[PDB]
């Protein structure tokens, strides 16, 4: 609804910024708005989402265990690790590490599970033999988060994502147990409560991911739909902002309530 892209342009006026804004068909992957849909912004830890894409591909391809355990050491925490570094001692298994990047954006553990399948240039590969070959990574957490302005390191547009995220979750790329598992672990969330669930109406379903780095840069990206089923796909991303992390979040999530407003 061009209603929704009012509130988008109003977010770039708020934040004195770049927002980039897609919004999806779930069902037939028809493009329904969209506002700099080719334009690139970091992904932050949206990528996230990606890399668990690919550990489960490999875990279909028995390549890979959602059991096995994974040990680290103080010399791997990195910056924000609420959940790896409380586990130092006991490890912790794929199905863990993928759980705690995704519902707590836990940056070692993304770190570790980057390991597991290759590194960002494999994650990149992935996506690459995919069909997308825009989205990419070429760092490890938490200098990806870096967004220096023009750098197309660890970079994708909100389009590229869009897609990208659709694939996963309803492609015939995974299985349909990891397809399910990926989005499970979507659906729960301890830290993304500021941005579009905000807006959310408690019956919707809703399965996300949200990102922030340097340079104001703050994203998001999900599946939702009224009444427990998600039936649209919506990336917001924007970079360059001097607004505090609130005014971002509230300006997202105001993106969010005209999303559903208007839905
Ligand atoms: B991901 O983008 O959520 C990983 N994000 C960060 O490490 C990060 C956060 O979120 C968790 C503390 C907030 C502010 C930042 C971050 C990274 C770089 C600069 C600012
Ligand atoms: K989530």
Redesign the pocket.
Known sequence: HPETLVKVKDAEDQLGARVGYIELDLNSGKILESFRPEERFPM???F?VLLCGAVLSRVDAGQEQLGRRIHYSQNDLV??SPVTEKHLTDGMTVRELCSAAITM?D?TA?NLLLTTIGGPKELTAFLHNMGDHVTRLDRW??EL??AIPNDERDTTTPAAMATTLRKLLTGELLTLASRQQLIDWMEADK?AGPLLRSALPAGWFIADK?????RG?RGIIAALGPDGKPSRIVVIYTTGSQAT?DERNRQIAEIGASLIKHW
Do not use: C, F, L
């Open positions: 932050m830890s949206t996230k910056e924000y954006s940056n993304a957490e938490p988060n870096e830290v949200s990102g922030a780095g340097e840069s992390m």
